[PDB]
């Protein structure tokens, strides 16, 4: 409804960069160590993108120290500071959940370069 749509549109940040699934993204995140306020980096492959305006989100997969970590980010959260894109993948699917079964050489994806 208009009532809700007015409340959402005011909260949404109006400067989100466009990224597709299969893009290597470096999300920056506000972390708090009690009193401190640090910016933590989280580089990884974008696996899934949910678009619902304010309620939009996206999954990033990162094969850190041995085992893999998947992190869903709420796009219009103030905790997400910046979403810098590094590589753009030539993938032809919306959700890249098949990457969870693969590792290493099979898990790598072709670049767009169009």
């Amino acid at each position: 409804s208009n009532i809700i749509k007015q409340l959402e549109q005011e909260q949404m940040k109006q400067d989100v960069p466009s990224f597709r699934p299969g893009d290597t993204v470096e999300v920056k995140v506000w972390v708090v160590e009690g009193s401190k306020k640090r910016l933590q980096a989280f580089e990884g492959v974008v696996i899934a993108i949910r678009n619902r305006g304010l309620h939009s989100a996206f999954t990033v997969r990162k094969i850190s120290n041995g085992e893999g970590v998947e992190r869903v980010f709420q796009t219009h959260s103030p905790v997400v500071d910046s979403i810098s894109v590094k590589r753009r993948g030539a993938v032809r699917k919306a959700k890249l959940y098949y990457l969870r079964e693969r590792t290493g050489k099979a898990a790598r994806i072709k670049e767009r370069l169009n």
Binding site: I4, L7, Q11, H55, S77, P78
Partner: protein
């Protein structure tokens, strides 16, 4: 006292601290006081309000008369609230959402979503019997419903299958978040009864 308000879906409010609080958006139109009941006439002090609008033909003459005595436009329905001694209201007064500006917590009341006829599993959290291991025609059934000859009867208030929901229920002490007067809204933290477009009754918390 209290206000009548349509439920208008849900959203979340992101605070810059780094928290999203899931809010129910309750739109609260001008709640106009149609009648004031007092201890002289009725035997209890109370007010009867209205809200929204209705169609000139769809309102009946008994209601249209009732509304004409106050001077207000005919609102879609009539609700009543008790008065807390100190406060006292006059007829034809339009109560705004600024009443909940100073308060912190509210008891939202509403008619719950009708789940229809419900089985004992869904209604009463009865445990499903073994899905195999020989079970014959009795996976989701209630099992026993009583003892044997001694009562020789099922006791009253036995939890059985039947109507679930479409009943009045009250979520108590939900935290008020934002109280927008311009758009006539009331944002409360958490989920409150009924469906989008259902009538709620919002009123201050009783367990302060």
């Amino acid at each position: 006292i209290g206000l009548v308000g349509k439920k208008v879906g849900m959203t979340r409010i992101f605070t810059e601290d780094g928290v999203s609080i899931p809010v129910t958006v309750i739109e609260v139109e001008a709640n106009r006081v149609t009648q004031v009941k007092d201890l002289a006439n009725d035997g209890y002090r109370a007010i009867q309000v209205t809200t929204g609008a209705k169609k000139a033909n769809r309102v009946t003459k008994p209601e249209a008369g009732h509304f004409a005595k106050a001077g207000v436009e005919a609102g879609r329905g009539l609700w009543e609230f008790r008065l807390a001694e100190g406060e006292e209201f006059t007829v034809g007064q339009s109560i705004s959402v600024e009443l909940f500006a100073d308060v912190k917590k509210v008891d939202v009341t509403g008619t719950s979503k009708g789940k229809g006829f419900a089985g004992t599993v869904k209604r009463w959290n009865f445990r499903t019997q073994d899905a195999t291991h020989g079970n014959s025609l009795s996976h989701r059934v209630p099992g026993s419903i009583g003892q044997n000859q001694t009562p020789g009867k099922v006791f009253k208030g036995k939890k059985m299958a039947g109507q679930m929901g479409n009943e009045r229920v009250t979520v108590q002490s939900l935290d008020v978040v934002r109280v927008d007067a311009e758009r006539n809204l009331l944002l409360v933290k958490g989920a409150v009864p009924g469906a989008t477009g259902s009538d709620l009754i919002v009123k201050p918390a009783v367990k302060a």
